[PDB]
């Protein structure tokens, strides 16, 4: 099955975490916990923003450009990224914006973290409608010493 995992400010705004105006270690731990031991598919700018392969995961980079690191797998299309994952129970797509667009129609599961912030940006997670997605998990948290904003984890399943 294919799943997307993303952190969304209000209005589904997304971005690179190292430039988002928040500190959310709890969400980063949520991400790691839900991606560990699974293939992760990411776009090139997401690759560059991370700066290193994610340990304990097969890293696949979807780009039209030739590869620049043998520690990860470089593919040129959505179908190739999927094929490169081989035979696994769950494929995690980790952005960014265009990658989320491309994979959403093939996905059965969403792991969303909603962040209580208004942040300007021209990139958004694609529209997911209640008609198509059943929310099967939600877990609300408030800001604290480590975490700058209210954040809510949500898992949805395609109806």
């Amino acid at each position, epitope marked *: 099955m294919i799943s997307l995992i993303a952190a*969304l400010a*209000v*209005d*589904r705004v997304i971005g690179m975490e190292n430039a988002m105006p928040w500190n959310l270690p709890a969400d980063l731990a949520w991400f790691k916990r839900n991606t560990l031991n699974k293939p992760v598919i990411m776009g090139r700018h997401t690759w560059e923003s991370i700066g290193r392969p994610l340990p304990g995961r097969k890293n696949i980079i979807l780009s039209s450009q030739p590869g620049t690191d043998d520690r990860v797998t470089w593919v040129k299309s959505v179908d190739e990224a999927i094929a490169a994952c081989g035979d696994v129970p769950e494929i995690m797509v980790i952005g960014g914006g265009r990658v989320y667009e491309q994979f959403l129609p093939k996905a059965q599961k969403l792991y969303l973290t*909603h962040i*209580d*912030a*208004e942040v300007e940006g021209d990139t958004h997670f694609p529209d997911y409608e209640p008609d198509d997605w059943e929310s099967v998990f*939600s877990e*609300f948290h*408030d*800001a604290d010493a480590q975490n700058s*904003h*209210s*954040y*809510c984890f949500e898992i949805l399943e395609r109806r």
Partner: nanobody
Amino acid sequence: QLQESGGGLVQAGGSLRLSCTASGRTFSSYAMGWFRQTPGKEREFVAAITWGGSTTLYADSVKGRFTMSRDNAKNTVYLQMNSLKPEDTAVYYCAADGSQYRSTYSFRDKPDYGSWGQGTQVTVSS
């Protein structure tokens, strides 16, 4: 499933505090807003706040006089109204966003309501 309270008579220059309490487990995934309507006139946007309470938006007519706040543990939003004046006189209503996790701007500029309060009359003397 919204219920306002507070309101009634206040002297000009005075303060009034409104609250809006909700029933329902999904309250804290929605933006909330305050509106005001006088008989036979337009309903007017007053304030909005995001789902988690951190971010607010106000009409220029109430900016710096009114504050909206939120307490998700109590499923409640509040409107603190200071420096009140006669033309603030109106029925005040709270409304829940019909769409989850939107900005204050989207709540105001792309209307979609899931729920409205019964309204509470606010009356400012002169």
